[PDB]
């Protein structure tokens, strides 16, 4: 099938088909004279049964769109033989967003890094649409192209404006196009069920198309799931897409014709940080609104999302809770605003937060901007510690087990099973990777904290021994005088009351045992603060996984084998028939898939999970040991200001003859 | 059985003739599967010239290899017969990742292999070679296209020896007579008897492998062969011989740079080599003794094994010289004490252990002279131990090799374009390597200067914490103790004690005043606005947010993919018409991307690095000068506290 088509300047092979639709096909072509490739869109023979009024609808829409996040329409030429108008537009090799969301890596949500890029580009393009006055009512992951930027960072772009119209900000259409799962309810009603009633829509459908897309890219799952799959139960799908209560972003049905579980929260399987979910779920619950009353406008949406995109991330790790946190804060905020963000995520008050960073405390003045903070990463975060007790939470993942392998040799039934069984092991690999970082950040901060209790202990000795000398020679300043108070004169047989300077001697000397008992009390502190003490991190290098164990690398090696089988089974499920030997290998490798998934899921729960929980217990007992010692060291620290302010007023009386 | 042209089989295995892994004069190797299981194996069938080397003496070699089981030997499972031809076939373990040669043909490794992988190669090659010597099998044929690579259970690669094509059973010392191998990795004795059809009574030992091991290691370490006669070594059959024979003692590489001209003999690694300076000083002597042509000064295996075992048994502590802007890997033994650690820092940075100050994770590092290196702080390369002296040091920076792009030849040549895309992509690979190193060095300087400045604040606070203790004694234990009871004799009593000590009290008290004058100046110089500021550090140089290395990697991937296509375009000697023009267009695209990357590398990464290097160098002066000045005040404090420590010893007399 080496047939081809060409225009005046481009040519393409019919076999080199990129995408496909009901209205046109998309090919990988080249410029005849430059060699550079473009995506060529030729319209099939059935698109010329549409009116000439409607076959220009996509042509005038793609004309008034020139922007990144919009697939660049390079030119528009006529094919040689058929004289059909075709669209020469830029070619994105990396596929669509749907191409990405099908990777088993992102089966439970995109990495939080990429999600912010999808957030950035979708809004930027969708804004450029309403800004130029076009409502593209077919926004779906298969529609959002991905191209690699000059800096390696992804850049997403919109296309496939076959479902478009010249929409004004208060105009509404009565026509029908789109794809099921990512379409507004009052367009799903008329398009799927051919049932129309009492509403027309314009510029509000896309907010729903965007919101459903964002939930998919965040959780790896569609937000509104009827049981038996979403292929049928359209009556149930509409029961969920419209009967959903305002403020709940997901509607899933567990049973067959059973309940409709509503939820306003992200699932535990989500990959995004908790600091982001609290910012994100409001946006989803307000563009996932059927009616125009309780819904958000484009004005409010673009303002709220830009607030998220215009923030910066400061990584903060709670040492008493063993929980990482991402602080989404503007660069113009203050330090006292920062403390508020940390309270909402850790439930520890602003007045209780000490900031350890790179083996040092952190001078935290409220009049300092966020951009002048020390640069933070997830591996080099700002630690936070509190002198009041906190529950050691730890990582809270979702316990996911493997699905049940089916013995029926089914080409697409094994491909669908290979996707999920690899995704489950993929999630466990991501969790074991986080469990490693949580343990390694524990070791990093505890060592920095121990070095700070030594700075707290060494600081008092420099002050206590500084008042032990202020009292050493202040007590002999009136002892060399009371020595001669009766050396030249009356016999000093015993100690009696002599004058105003006799009580400033018998009570001031009491600060030699009341303070002498502190010098011996600090020794018990320095003992437990020493290598052999009851506060050593000897267990920290003894419990839990280590990076030198390479547990994550071992899991990744099993996962590669599982992934190679899955990518093979999708080649197999294309053309649903296999030769004899090929069928047997498929059956053999199907069993190896279960072997690798079992070995992986075993090593996760037995080596990574078991030792992490063992590490979380040997650290729960050390939190109390340390927080109790800080309570004692500070009580001794405050005594050296009650002993030294007392030897201050009596220091004036002792400077005399 | 098969249809004669597409597949062969044994009783237990079968394979397609298209799934061919390797060819050879005696046999070919295919990718096959166990019949009853489906699991994969490499199948080696001996068609022709299997009868050239005797069958019984070669069959007994197979049975003893069937019992061989080691990590670094390709397992020989069973030995069977092909169904219809009845040729002997060996079933072996399949290594999907290919050979070490495939790894060295990547552009990423066009120069040094990454140090991590090189240690793996050194470990496995030595491990497998020792297993053969301990079982009495001579390889005499080892080359990169011969060392297989598999991915272990932990993702780290595991190399496995195979194709003992020159092999028989050997003792520790006897006589031989054979000829097998490939030209480049060959001992000079065999290079005459296998390339230039000329024989002599020259003898061997355990050393003929040691030369091939030496040439193979140098290749993996530098990306090039150690002996190159002007043109390709495969063309100058005579000049290549003249080099290895007259190889001077100590030299490990000879390259003829001018045609029929002199041969530049080098005794150390090229600058382009990726390996650390710490490892080079250990690897170079090993390569020297094994690349010895004559058996009189060669090493022998017992010494070669224990020597490389020492390199492998060492761990690495990462150390960054803050004043020199140089990173260092320290190959120390786990049982080695802390004292020898300082020795290794000396040999690399010229900093004696008396002025070796160590910072790690925000604080100084105290070094107990007997602490074991297996309990040092764990060090990554981005989390090293910083070393500073109070003594001046030349700020060196990173020493890389200025490698410009080759001249892209304009002629349409399927072979030339493929061989040119290899080199030019490798140059952008080396440039991207350095671009990442430069950014690390700059980010480590920022992490070090930030810590050191905070350390000087600790040294400052320690001395001002001491000044408040001698003044609370000088002004109180002397000015008050003496003025009350001692300067009131009006008659031991009134001697040089009242005259000299009262003056020295006021000598020290008045001079101590201007010590506070110089102390607040130092506090001002390391305060926010002072001459010692982190300001220029956050302003000069490239940054992670710049994403230079990512930008360079994007260009490199387009070049890499064009090269991999030109590789397949070379598989055909002739290209179809439209394919020829794509290859002609992508050739210009390949050179466009390269010059674009080299521009951004030199104008962005290099310049701002060198600009950062200067503002670094000028800050070292102002830093080292401030520490010398604060120290002089610190010793004045102890001096004043010492002078007063005995004047107070006579104020406690109190007999007047």
């Amino acid at each position: 099938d080496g047939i081809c088509q060409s225009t005046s300047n481009h040519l393409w092979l019919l076999s080199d088909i990129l995408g496909q639709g009901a209205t046109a096909n998309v090919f990988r072509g080249r410029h005849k004279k430059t060699g550079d490739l473009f995506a060529i869109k030729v319209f099939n023979n059935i698109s010329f049964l549409r009116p000439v009024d409607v076959q220009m609808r996509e042509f005038e829409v793609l004309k008034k769109l020139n922007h990144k996040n919009i697939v660049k329409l390079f030119a528009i030429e006529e094919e040689t033989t058929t004289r059909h108008k075709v669209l020469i537009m830029e070619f994105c090799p990396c596929g669509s967003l749907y191409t990405v969301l099908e990777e088993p890596s992102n089966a439970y949500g995109l990495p939080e890094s990429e999600f912010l890029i999808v957030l950035r580009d979708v809004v930027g393009g969708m804004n450029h649409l309403r800004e130029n006055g076009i409502v593209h009512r077919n926004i779906k992951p298969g529609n959002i192209m991905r191209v690699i930027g000059e800096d390696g960072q992804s850049v997403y772009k919109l296309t496939d404006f076959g479902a478009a119209r010249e929409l004004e900000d208060d105009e509404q259409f009565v026509e029908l196009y789109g794809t099921e799962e990512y379409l507004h309810p009052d367009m799903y009603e008329r398009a799927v069920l051919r049932k129309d009633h009492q509403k027309k829509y314009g510029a509000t459908v896309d907010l729903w198309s965007i919101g459903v897309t964002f939930y998919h890219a965040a959780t790896g799952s569609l937000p509104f799931r009827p049981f038996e799959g979403p292929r049928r139960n359209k009556e149930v799908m509409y029961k969920i897409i419209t009967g959903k209560p305002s403020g709940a972003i997901s509607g899933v049905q567990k049973a067959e014709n059973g309940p409709i579980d509503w939820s306003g929260d992200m699932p535990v399987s989500c990959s995004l940080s908790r600091g982001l979910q609290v910012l994100l779920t409001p946006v989803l619950a307000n563009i996932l609104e059927a009616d125009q009353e309780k819904c958000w406008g484009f004005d409010q949406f673009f303002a709220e999302t830009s607030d998220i995109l215009h923030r910066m991330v400061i990584h903060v790790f709670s040492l008493q809770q063993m929980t990482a946190h991402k602080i989404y804060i503007h660069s113009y905020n203050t330090a006292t605003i920062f403390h508020e963000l940390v309270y909402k995520q850790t439930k520890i008050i602003s007045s209780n937060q000490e900031l350890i960073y790179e083996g040092r405390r952190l001078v935290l003045e409220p009049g300092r901007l966020a951009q002048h903070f020390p640069k933070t990463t997830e591996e080099n975060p700002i630690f936070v510690v509190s002198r009041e007790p906190l529950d050691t939470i730890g990582l809270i993942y979702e316990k996911i087990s493997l699905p049940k392998v089916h013995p029926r040799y089914d080409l697409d039934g094994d491909a669908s099973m290979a996707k999920a069984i690899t995704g489950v092991v993929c999630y466990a690999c991501r969790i074991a990777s986080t469990l490693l970082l949580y343990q390694e950040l524990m070791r990093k901060g505890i060592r920095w904290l121990i070095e700070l209790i030594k700075d707290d202990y060494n600081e008092t000795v420099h002050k206590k021994t500084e008042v032990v000398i202020t009292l050493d020679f202040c007590i002999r300043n009136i002892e060399k005088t009371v020595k001669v108070y009766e050396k030249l004169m009356k016999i000093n047989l015993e100690a009696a009351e002599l004058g105003e300077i006799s009580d400033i001697h018998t009570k001031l000397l009491r600060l030699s045992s009341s303070q002498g008992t502190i010098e011996t009390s600090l020794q018990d502190i320095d003992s437990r603060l020493s290598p052999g003490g009851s506060l050593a991190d000897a267990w920290a290098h003894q419990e839990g996984t280590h990076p030198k164990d390479r547990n994550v690398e071992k899991l990744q090696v099993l996962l590669n084998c599982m992934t190679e089988i899955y990518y093979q089974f999708k080649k197999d499920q294309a053309e649903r028939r296999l030769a004899y030997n090929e069928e047997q290998i498929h059956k053999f490798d199907k069993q190896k898939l279960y072997y690798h998934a079992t070995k992986a899921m075993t090593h996760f729960t037995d080596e990574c999970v078991k030792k992490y929980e063992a590490f979380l217990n040997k650290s729960e007992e050390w939190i109390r040991k340390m927080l109790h010692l800080r309570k004692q060291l500070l009580s001794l620290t405050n005594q050296c200001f009650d002993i030294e302010e007392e030897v201050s007023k009596y220091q004036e009386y002792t400077n005399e003859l | 059985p098969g249809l004669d042209g597409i597949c062969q089989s044994t009783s237990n295995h079968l394979w397609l003739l298209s799934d061919i892994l390797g060819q050879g004069a005696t046999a070919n190797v295919f990718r096959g599967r166990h019949k009853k299981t489906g699991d994969l194996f490499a199948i080696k069938v001996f068609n022709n010239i299997s009868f050239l080397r005797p069958v019984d003496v070669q069959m007994r070699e197979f049975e003893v290899l069937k019992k061989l089981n080691h990590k670094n030997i390709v397992k020989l499972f069973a030995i069977e017969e092909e169904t219809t031809t009845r040729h002997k076939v060996l079933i072996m373990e399949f290594c999907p990742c290919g050979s070490l040669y495939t790894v060295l043909e990547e552009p990423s490794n066009a120069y040094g292999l990454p140090e991590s992988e090189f240690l793996i190669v050194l470990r496995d090659v030595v491990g497998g070679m020792n297993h053969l010597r301990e079982n009495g099998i001579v390889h005499r044929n080892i080359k990169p296209g011969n060392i297989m690579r598999v991915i272990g259970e932990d993702g780290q690669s595991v190399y496995k020896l195979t194709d003992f094509g020159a092999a028989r059973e050997l003792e520790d010392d006897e006589q031989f007579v054979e000829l097998y191998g490939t030209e480049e990795y060959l001992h000079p004795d065999m290079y005459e008897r296998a390339v230039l059809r000329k024989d002599h009574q020259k003898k061997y030992g355990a050393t003929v492998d040691l030369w091939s091991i030496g040439v193979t290691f140098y290749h993996a370490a530098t990306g090039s062969l150690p002996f190159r006669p002007f043109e390709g070594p495969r063309r100058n059959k005579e000049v290549m011989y003249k080099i290895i024979t007259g190889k001077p003692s100590g030299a490990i590489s000879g390259v003829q740079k001018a045609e029929n001209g002199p041969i530049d003999w080098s005794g150390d690694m090229p600058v382009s080599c990726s390996l650390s300076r710490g490892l080079q000083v250990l690897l170079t002597p090993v390569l020297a003794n094994i690349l010895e042509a004559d058996q009189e000064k060669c090493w022998g295996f017992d010494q070669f094994f224990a020597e490389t075992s020492d390199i492998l048994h060492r761990m690495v502590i990462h150390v960054f010289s803050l004043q020199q802007m140089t990173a260092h890997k320290i190959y120390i033994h786990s049982y080695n004490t802390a004292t020898i650690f300082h020795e290794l820092v000396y040999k690399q940075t010229k900093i004696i252990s008396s002025n070796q100050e160590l910072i790690y994770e925000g604080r100084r590092l105290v070094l107990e002279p007997g602490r074991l290196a297996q309990h040092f702080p764990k060090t990554t390369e981005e989390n090293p131990i910083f070393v500073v002296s109070r003594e001046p040091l030349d700020t060196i920076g990173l020493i890389y090799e200025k490698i410009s792009l080759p001249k892209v030849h304009p002629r349409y040549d399927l072979d030339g374009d493929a061989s040119m895309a290899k080199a030019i992509t490798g140059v952008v690979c080396y440039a991207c390597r350095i671009a990442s190193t430069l950014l690390l060095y700059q980010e480590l300087m920022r992490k070090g200067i930030r810590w050191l400045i905070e350390l000087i604040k600790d040294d400052y606070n320690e001395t001002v914490h001491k000044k408040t203790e001698v003044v609370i004694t000088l002004d109180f234990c002397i000015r008050n103790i003496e003025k009350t009871v001692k300067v009131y004799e009006k008659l031991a009593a009134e001697l040089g004690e009242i005259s000299d000590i009262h003056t020295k009290l006021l000598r020290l008290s008045s001079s101590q005043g201007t010590i506070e004058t110089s102390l607040q100046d130092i506090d001002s110089r390391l305060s926010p606005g002072g001459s010692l500021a982190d300001a220029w550090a956050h302003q000069e140089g490239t940054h992670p947010k710049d994403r230079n290395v990512e930008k360079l990697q994007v260009l490199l991937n387009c070049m890499t993919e064009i090269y991999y296509q030109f590789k397949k375009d070379q598989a055909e000697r002739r290209l179809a018409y439209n394919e020829e023009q794509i290859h002609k267009f992508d050739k210009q695209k390949l050179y466009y991307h390269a010059t674009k990357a080299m521009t951004h590398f030199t104008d962005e990464c290099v310049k701002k690095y060198e600009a950062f290097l200067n503002k670094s160098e000028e800050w070292i002066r102002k830093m080292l000068h401030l520490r010398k000045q604060l120290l002089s005040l610190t010793n004045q404090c102890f001096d004043i506290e010492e002078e007063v420590s005995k004047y107070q010893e006579y104020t406690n007399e109190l007999q007047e």
Binding site: V405, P407, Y409, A579, Y580, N581, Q584, I585, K587, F588, K590, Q591 | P1, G2, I6, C7, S9, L14, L16, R33, K35, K36, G38, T83
Partner: peptide
């Protein structure tokens, strides 16, 4: 689960 059968040289 035991559907896979031994590979055969005659299908290749």
């Amino acid at each position: 689960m035991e559907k896979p059968l031994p590979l055969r040289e005659d299908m290749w």
